[model samples]
Target: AAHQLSDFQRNKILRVFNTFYDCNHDGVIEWDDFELAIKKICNLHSWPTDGKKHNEARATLKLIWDGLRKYADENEDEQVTKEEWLKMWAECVKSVEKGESLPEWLTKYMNFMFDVNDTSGDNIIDKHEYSTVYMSYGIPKSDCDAAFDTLSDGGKTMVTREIFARLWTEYFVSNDRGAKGNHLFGTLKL
Candidate 1:
């Protein structure tokens, strides 16, 4: 039998899709969304269009787009609608429940986000780094502060790559609104 997504799961997934993936809020995700994300990141960091950072960002987002299209563009329309996105997550959640490793594409995305937030290159995401990157996404500074605190265990723990991977997994799989990973993208309306 196919696994069904609970309302809590659907809500979180939709939040991520609408807030981050659907960059222009056009109700679909395509190359345009990735392009807009690249532009936003580049602008946030002042990376010149011709610079290595800009090139890397472009390439990374392209890889992500390819992965998403391959997995979620069921109609071969080159665009992932909300339904398609949810369908993809249902499969992903099922796979995760089966105890399989995370898909390679998702791991790539996780690494990309970790690197982006770890602007200091210290291999750890400190509170300031977390706030800076998330703030660029338009999350309020106060919310970012609360999220960072929760995700980092009240500022007592370091958000290392391994730690981040666990949180990322939890963010996608956990249906609990109070789960620490729910704050991965900042506080979401329950």
Candidate 2:
């Protein structure tokens, strides 16, 4: 439900400078620092400054929240884990790759969440990425952070498994989200 972009995926999308996390001279991200990233990213695809472009941010942010909440706990009381974060990133990126655009507001909102999640200087997101920019490394100094190892570890590197696993997990979540019933992120381009 988050990040959606891996180091490889980011390397693929950002080679055009569209990755946009290179803000303020620092190589880190914050919870709300994705605005610049968004501009840089969408602009790469010549994505117009339309409503869909903006909504992408919203859907992305919602996805991040959903992901974070997943790792909170059985009682849902704590922050998310790195493993959960990575899974969410994979999910969102997979969805977008299939051709789904969200609202600008959502995209921007997710940008902020991105900063919140990328706590480590690990450029490679351990669990978080679906959020948008959040890659500034600085904040109002009032927010909280978590250790990357807090989540479950089911994979490595970009932090994931194979195609069947990917498809299986994606479908499981999709089914739970009631996609067959209401469609959250809606259908993909395929």
Candidate 3:
């Protein structure tokens, strides 16, 4: 049954602790469903202020859009179809460990994207239906476009799936021990 799903996909189903309603169970996620997902995500962070919350969301959106647009362009898929987004969610979970920005970015960006990408304005993202997409939503559309030119046919970007997961698991275990960021950025304040 669920074995057909990837680890990232399965973790996404689990990450919300099952509070999220994937409704049709077709593995596709809609705007409302994603909003519910983002809401649960945002609620998890301890924002120091209202402004911080907004900033966090903004920063988060940039990270997700970067990841989404990268994949979308690579596959020639305009919109990140449900399965694609599911894969991205899986990637996001993996990124959390090695210090990739997906989880933190989704913490802030998910809703903003729903508003921007659901161009049919139906709140449901399907094939060839990304008219609502906007470059300005996450990072600057101009810069985002420019940066994409740097990738090759292999679709190589800085964050790989295995790196994403391992680093995330590493970071999570260390957070209680007083550490953050990866590489030298990690420190045990404890």
What C-alpha lDDT do the candidate models reach, one value each? 0.88, 0.36, 0.39
lDDT of 3 by residue, 1-190 (tens): 2224444335434433232334234444343444444454344333333566546655564565565456433465434455565555555545554565545434334355443334455544332222112122223444333322221112343322333343344432333333222211112223
Instruction: Tell me each candidate's RMSD, in Å, in order.
Output: 1.3, 17.2, 17.2
Q: In order, how many clashes per candidate?
A: 0, 44, 12
Determine which window of 10 residues in candidate 2 has minimal summed lDDT: 181-190
Per-candidate TM-score against the hidden true structure: 0.95, 0.26, 0.29
Rank order (by lDDT, best first): 1, 3, 2
Ranking 2 against 3 by lDDT, winner: 3
Error at 174, model 1, angstroms? 0.9
In candidate 1, what are the lDDT values of residues 105-158, reduced to their tens digit?
A: 788889999998888889999998889988887899999998898988986889
Candidate 3 regions with alpha-carbon error over 4 angstroms: 1-26, 29-34, 42-50, 72-78, 82-190
lDDT of 2 by residue, 17-60 (tens): 22233343243333343455555555533566666745675467
Model 3 TM-score, 2 decimals: 0.29
Ranking by TM-score: 1, 3, 2
Q: What is the lDDT of residue 128 in candidate 1?
A: 89
lDDT score for candidate 3 against the true structure: 0.39
